[PDB]
């Protein structure tokens, strides 16, 4: 693809109820959220992309 900006992610943990906010260079916020949630073992409603 050679997008000028390569893949990048900033993950900001909130320390509460598994909450986490991620700033990402992605075309798919839904899957990013789901995959992060499943990996951590927390509900989707705790992850915001």
Residues 6+ away with beta carbon under 8 Å from 10: 22, 23, 24
Residues 6+ away with beta carbon under 8 Å from 33: 44, 47, 48, 49
Contact positions with Ca ion (CB under 5 A) in 1-49: 1
> How many residues at the interface with its own copies, by CB under 8 A?
32
Positions at the binding site for Mo-molybdopterin: 27
Positions at the binding site: 27
Using CB under 8 A, list all residues that contact its own copies: 3, 5, 8-10, 12, 14-17, 19, 23-25, 27-31, 33-34, 37, 39-41, 43-49
């Amino acid at each position: 693809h050679f997008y000028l900006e390569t893949n990048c992610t900033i993950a900001v943990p909130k320390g509460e109820a598994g909450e986490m906010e991620l700033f990402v260079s992605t075309q798919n916020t839904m899957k990013t959220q789901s995959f992060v949630a499943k990996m951590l073992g927390v509900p989707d409603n705790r992850i915001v992309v």
